[PDB]
Design a protein around this ligand. Structure first.
Ligand SMILES: O=S([O-])[O-]
Ligand SMILES: [Mn+2]
Length: 336
């Protein structure tokens, strides 16, 4: 039940009566959260803007620079872009009463918050690869992708075009040495490179591709409901998890509505609704559903096989020229 937002915030939110969100989260994934927020707080008109991760950063920066009305709350899997904004004066400092036991590495102090722990998984078409054929390690996937029969049948992110594709593949490269071998295997298999989870899943579902690497498990579980032939394989040699980052615009027209929504996302109710109905992999460990930390940990063989990218300024290294250059120079030569 009800998030522990202050009564004064709730009244103030009622005077605002509107809530502008910029979000990367596919609205079809996010809808159950909007619907459930509407029941808590029927008096808040929501404008959900489903936008690419890069478009959110560019939109917010230019709107802000012009004095324009922008969003009240920004929610996105592009973790570098969000931590940059939130560490540079775009964030309203708010100490959420629902985050008192958030680890220090899932919050930028009072400036920004992790709302999810979403694994980068393998999705495959069971009509072309049965489960016993899909390896669960970067080594195994590399050997599979040496098969001629797999040439043209693999998708992954374009880290040059998707800002969250950059987040995932950069974290894969920093933490798993076997990633390099796997990247070159993508070059051998003429891997096709995608700027959205949806584009890659359709191609996999159609059979144009047999296997997609590094897309959100959240989206793949939702799609599985409707597509029997869509398979999910979790990596047992190490799993990158993103934490979808939430902050309030310092210059929100409706800061208290943004506070309620943030508090909702962090609450036992939002996290449970995430795990059970939105099928978004929740941040809280005491959640019930398919999309949970406990179902991820079981799948990969323990919490210690998950590298959770922290909501920290440390990850801005990923935007420093020399760090950006080494990754993308590696990636372009590997993938060919
Ligand atoms: O591959 S399905 O069984 O998650
Ligand atoms: Mn999306």
């Amino acid at each position: 039940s009800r998030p522990a937002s202050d009564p004064q915030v709730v009244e103030a939110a009622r005077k605002e009566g509107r809530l502008i969100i910029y979000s990367a989260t596919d609205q079809s994934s996010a809808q159950a959260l909007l619907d459930d927020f509407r029941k808590l707080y029927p008096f808040i008109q929501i404008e959900y803007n489903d936008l690419g991760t890069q478009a959110i950063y560019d939109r917010f920066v230019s709107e802000t620079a012009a004095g324009a009305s922008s969003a009240d709350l920004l929610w996105s899997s592009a973790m570098e872009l969000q931590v940059k904004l939130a560490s540079e004066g775009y964030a309203l400092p708010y100490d959420s009463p629902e985050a008192k036991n958030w680890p220090a590495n899932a919050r930028l102090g009072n400036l920004a918050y992790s709302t999810t722990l979403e694994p980068a998984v393998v999705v495959y078409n069971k009509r072309f690869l049965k489960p016993e054929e899909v390896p669960t390690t970067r080594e195994g996937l590399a050997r599979l992708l040496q098969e001629p029969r797999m040439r043209g049948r693999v998708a992954t992110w374009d880290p040059e075009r998707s800002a969250v594709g950059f987040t995932i593949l950069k974290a894969d490269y920093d933490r798993f040495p076997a990633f390099q071998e796997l990247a070159r295997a993508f070059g051998k298999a003429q891997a096709a490179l995608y700027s959205s989870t949806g584009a890659a899943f359709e191609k996999v579902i159609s059979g144009e591709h047999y296997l997609a690497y590094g897309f959100f498990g959240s989206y793949a579980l939702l799609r599985q409901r409707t597509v029997k032939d869509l398979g999910i394989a979790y990596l047992t040699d190490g799993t990158v998890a993103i934490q979808r980052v939430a902050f309030i615009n310092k210059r929100a027209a409706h800061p208290n509505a943004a506070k309620l929504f943030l508090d909702y996302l962090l609450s036992l109710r939002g996290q449970n609704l995430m795990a059970y109905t939105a099928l978004i992999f929740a941040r809280r460990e005491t959640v019930v559903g398919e999309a949970t930390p406990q179902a991820l940990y079981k799948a990969v063989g323990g919490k210690d096989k998950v590298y959770a990218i922290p909501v920290s300024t440390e990850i801005l290294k990923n935007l420093d020229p020399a760090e950006r250059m080494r990754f993308l120079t590696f990636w372009r030569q590997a993938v060919r």
